[PDB]
């Protein structure tokens, strides 16, 4: 079944025969028996092909090679035995192969390597021995053959490298030793490797820095990442000045010598992370071909003023997670395309810091203490796409030089109350601003080939043009405010001014009138604010919510509502007491206590942070999750509570059953107030539950409709459905006529 290519090359992989194929041409020069099921090669198995030149025995469960089996293969050059079950390197089986160039013995379960092994292999060039179970480096077999050029010993159980282990491999070029359990390296373990150009020590147990690598003058690639090493001392690479790449990541490092990375002329990258005991910039004299630089998580507070003028080919510069507070002048470097200064202590950006960086594309200044940026800091800076100054304390932001900026991030700068004109950022695609009102003028109706995405959204609780919204909601709010104000004033004047004796019920009615008047004053505040800023509210919300006016409006609203509810409960208690059968002074004291409680409830959100500024309505019931959950849940809890106690009380006298009249007035008051409180509580609770989805515009409209409505309604009922008021009005008219 062997597939013959006809070019003196034979393929026999995978057809499952357990012996050497027979009947093959005598002139063949390549033969493949991989994937087969050959376990042992009998004596003189390959004597039929004296012209063989490449042989592959991989995948076979082969675990024995006769000493004379591979004899007579003088012209063989490549021999692979990978994946097999050879328990030891075959010493007295490859002895006669005097013209072999490459030998694979990797992925076998090799435990021991006979000392006499590898004798006579005067033409070997590459050796594979990785993924084996060798406990120590075989010194004699390696010393046997001096012509080796590549060697790998990875994925093994070697723990220490003895002195002069590789003394005689003068021609070695590549040495792999990664994925091992090496933790101790002798001072002379790497002697004689004059031509070595690649050393791999990754994934080991090294804790102290290897002193041996000082004897590798031709080193070009060195890797020791994912080790235990912590200290890299000065003179680490002094003996190997041809280094190009060094891999040292995934290593817990504390201190790196100041002269560790000097005189490496062709080193092109440098990444150091976690070296927490470093406090000064490395001596980089002699290192001029650096393309990248990454010093992260250290205590460096300065950057050399000659870094830009030395590294001509610098392309990336990462200096985050340090204590850098003063920046040098970057004008020297032209190829620099990314700069990261994230999470540092920089407090100022001057116009000279970024002058002349003609190729800078990405700039990061997130999470620093910058409070002043020069107006022309980015003026002559070249074509930049990404800018990031998030989580600083910025008061103003420059405009010139940022027209071709695709991305901008300004979040976290709560003092940045200005507005960014969309004329400057004609090509911006993604924006982040501290306040949602700043992105209103930017995206317009989008949030004409704009596709501009702004991080803080304006979901009708941060209005762009009109605060109240549709015309009908503006008219009804205006009407509510007018009627509430006028009728509350009229009720107060009739009840209090024209009187000589104040019964408890009448005084309570007057107090509810006062609270409703305060609610109406809040509604008038809202109406005038909307009217003044009509179609331009995006220029007002930042000043409104983060100002004293919103605090005033929120306090007025909360105080009026709480006072009305508490006075409604006190009236329900007095009605019960009057129906039971002086205490008028006691009830006056109780009314003062209720007023004080309403005042303290209103004042409470002032010291707490993040409630009165949630919405331009200055209410503690905004859209979405309430930032101060506790305050809102308490307020609604104790409101529904007092509602249920007065409901229970009036149920009690209903069961129990002039003075008999006017009780229905208080009943209607409790009816209207409770049925108007339910929607506000329901739509404050709704955003907490993810099951119910409510459009924010409808929520805001209904809140604006029903929050102040009881203030509009109560004096209407007192003024039209109570003969008590008609008598008071007659008395007032009689007093006026006098």
């Amino acid at each position: 079944p062997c597939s013959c290519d006809g070019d003196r090359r034979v393929d026999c992989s995978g057809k499952g025969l357990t012996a050497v194929p027979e009947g093959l041409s005598a002139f063949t020069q390549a033969l493949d028996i991989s994937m087969n099921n050959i376990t042992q090669l009998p004596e003189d198995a390959f004597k039929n092909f004296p012209f063989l030149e490449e042989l592959q025995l991989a995948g076979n469960d082969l675990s024995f090679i006769h000493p004379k089996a591979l004899s007579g293969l003088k012209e063989l050059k490549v021999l692979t035995l990978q994946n097999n079950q050879l328990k030891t390197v075959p010493s007295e089986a490859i002895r006669g192969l005097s013209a072999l160039q490459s030998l694979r013995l990797d992925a076998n379960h090799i435990t021991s390597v006979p000392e006499d092994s590898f004798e006579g292999l005067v033409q070997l060039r590459h050796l594979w021995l990785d993924d084996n179970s060798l406990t120590e480096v075989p010194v004699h077999p390696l010393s046997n053959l001096p012509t080796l050029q590549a060697l790998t010993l990875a994925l093994n159980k070697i723990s220490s490298i003895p002195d002069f282990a590789f003394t005689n491999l003068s021609s070695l070029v590549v040495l792999h030793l990664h994925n091992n359990k090496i933790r101790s390296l002798s001072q002379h373990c790497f002697d004689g490797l004059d031509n070595l150009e690649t050393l791999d020590l990754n994934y080991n147990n090294l804790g102290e820095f290897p002193q041996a690598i000082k004897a590798l003058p031709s080193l070009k690639e060195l890797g020791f990442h994912s080790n235990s090493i912590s200290v890299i001392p000065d003179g680490a690479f002094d003996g190997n000045p041809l280094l190009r790449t060094i891999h040292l990541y995934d290593n817990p490092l504390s201190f790196v010598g100041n002269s560790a990375f000097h005189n490496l002329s062709d080193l092109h990258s440098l990444v150091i992370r976690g070296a927490s005991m470093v406090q000064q910039f490395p001596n980089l004299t002699g290192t001029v071909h650096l393309e990248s630089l990454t010093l992260t998580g250290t205590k460096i507070s300065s950057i050399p003023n000659n870094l830009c003028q030395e590294q001509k080919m610098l392309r990336t510069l990462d200096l985050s997670y340090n204590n850098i507070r003063d920046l040098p002048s970057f004008n020297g470097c032209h190829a620099l395309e990314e700069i990261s200064l994230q999470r540092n202590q920089i407090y100022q950006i001057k116009e000279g810091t970024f002058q002349g960086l003609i190729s800078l594309r990405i700039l990061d200044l997130s999470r620093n203490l910058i409070h002043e940026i020069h107006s022309r800091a980015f003026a002559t800076l070249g074509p930049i796409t990404n800018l990031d100054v998030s989580f600083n304390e910025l008061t103003s932001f420059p405009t010139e030089g940022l027209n071709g900026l695709n991305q901008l991030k300004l979040v976290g700068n709560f003092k940045l109350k200005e507005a960014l004109a969309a004329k400057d950022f004609v090509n911006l695609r993604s924006l982040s601003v501290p306040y949602a009102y700043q992105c209103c003028a930017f995206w317009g109706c989008d949030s004409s080939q704009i596709i501009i995405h702004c991080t803080p959204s304006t979901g009708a609780f941060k209005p762009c043009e009109y605060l109240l919204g549709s015309w009908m909601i503006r008219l009804t709010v205006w009407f509510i405010f007018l009627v509430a104000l006028f009728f509350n004033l009229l009720v107060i004047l009739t009840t209090f001014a024209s009187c000589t004796s104040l019964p408890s019920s009448k005084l309570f009615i007057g107090l509810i009138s006062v609270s409703n008047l305060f609610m109406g004053i809040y509604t008038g505040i809202l109406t005038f604010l909307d009217a003044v800023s009509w179609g331009r509210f995006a220029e007002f919300g930042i000043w409104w919510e983060t100002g004293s006016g919103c605090k005033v409006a929120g306090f007025l609203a909360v105080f009026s509502s709480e006072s009305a509810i508490f006075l409604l409960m006190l009236a329900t208690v007095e009605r019960s007491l009057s129906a039971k059968d002086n205490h008028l002074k006691q009830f006056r004291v109780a009314a003062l206590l209720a007023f004080l409680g309403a005042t303290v409830a209103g004042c409470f959100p002032l010291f707490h942070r993040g409630e009165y500024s949630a919405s331009p309505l200055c209410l503690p019931f905004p859209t979405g999750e309430t930032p101060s959950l506790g305050f809102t849940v308490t307020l609604v809890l104790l409101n529904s509570l007092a509602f249920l106690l007065m409901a229970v009380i009036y149920t009690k006298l209903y069961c129990n059953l002039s003075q008999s009249s006017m009780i229905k007035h208080v009943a209607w008051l409790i009816f209207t107030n409770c049925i108007f409180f339910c929607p506000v509580a329901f739509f404050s609770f709704a955003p907490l539950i993810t099951a119910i989805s409510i459009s924010p515009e409808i929520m805001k409209s209904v809140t604006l409709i029903f929050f102040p409505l009881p203030a509009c309604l109560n004096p209407v009922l007192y003024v039209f459905f109570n003969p008590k008021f008609k008598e008071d009005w007659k008395l007032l008219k009689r007093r006026v006529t006098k």
């Epitope: 000493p67 010493s91 007295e92 006979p114």
Partner: nanobody, 110 residues
């Protein structure tokens, strides 16, 4: 029971260096049951002491191995291996020995 396993030198004497006896299970690796080095030094594996003994002699250059305490699991393909190129140290693996015999197969009895 007990049985005699004798392996002799076909040509030039093989006693000048280490000679041993190996056993191979059907289809897997040859494993070494015993070995003897010049000067009479002998090495046995884990399941060999007390039930297998080996001795050379250079009088007529021949190895011999008394086997006893017969167990069912200890039935395999037995070979005698030799090495006369000197150097190195004696061992228990197959790779070291330069010469190999055709071997004898014995089945456990009683």
């Amino acid at each position: 029971g007990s049985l005699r396993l004798s392996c002799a030198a076909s040509g030039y004497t093989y006693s000048p260096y280490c000679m041993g006896w190996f056993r191979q299970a059907p289809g897997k690796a040859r494993e070494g049951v015993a070995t003897v080095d010049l000067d009479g030094s002998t090495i046995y594996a884990d399941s060999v002491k007390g039930r297998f003994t080996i001795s050379q002699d250079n009088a007529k250059n021949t190895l011999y191995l008394q086997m006893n305490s017969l167990k069912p699991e200890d039935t395999a393909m037995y070979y005698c291996a030799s090495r006369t190129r000197a150097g190195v140290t004696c061992g228990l693996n197959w790779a070291i020995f330069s010469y190999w015999g055709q071997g004898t197969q014995v089945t456990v009895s009683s």
